[PDB]
């Protein structure tokens, strides 16, 4: 199934934060309405924050996370969770290799902000 794609309410600010846990350099692209709105590139084997940014979900609210390492797309897993009918988390993990820890880039989207 498609992973890393989330429908947000329109015209809503959301946070996006990426952590790295891999020998490979992670390139995280965050697309809003099918166009890149933020790009993070970093490398860590100890969960360093490689990027954090506030974005706006725009006209349609479609947000997509893509992760690549050395130009190759990583395999993604994802889900969205809502607490008290209000607080939203969109969660992404990714695997760039063979050990299937799925933490090589970890991306957390959260809204509302402010």
């Amino acid at each position: 199934a498609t992973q890393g794609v989330f429908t947000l309410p329109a015209n809503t600010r959301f946070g996006v934060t990426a952590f790295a846990n891999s020998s490979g350099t992670q390139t995280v692209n965050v697309l809003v309405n099918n166009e890149t709105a933020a790009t993070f590139s970093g490398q860590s084997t100890n969960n360093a924050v490689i990027g954090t940014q506030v974005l706006n979900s725009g006209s349609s609210g479609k947000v997509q996370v893509q992760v690549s390492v050395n130009g190759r797309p990583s395999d993604l897993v994802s889900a969205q969770v809502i607490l008290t009918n209000e607080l939203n988390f969109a969660l992404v993990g990714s695997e760039d290799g063979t050990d299937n820890d799925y933490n090589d880039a970890v991306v957390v989207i959260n809204w509302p902000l402010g």
């Binding site: 020998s23 490979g24 290799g97 063979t98």
Partner: peptide, 12 residues
């Protein structure tokens, strides 16, 4: 993790 899996691992 199989032939491709290995090749992937060796190339890294």
């Amino acid at each position: 993790x199989x032939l491709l899996x290995c090749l992937x691992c060796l190339l890294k």
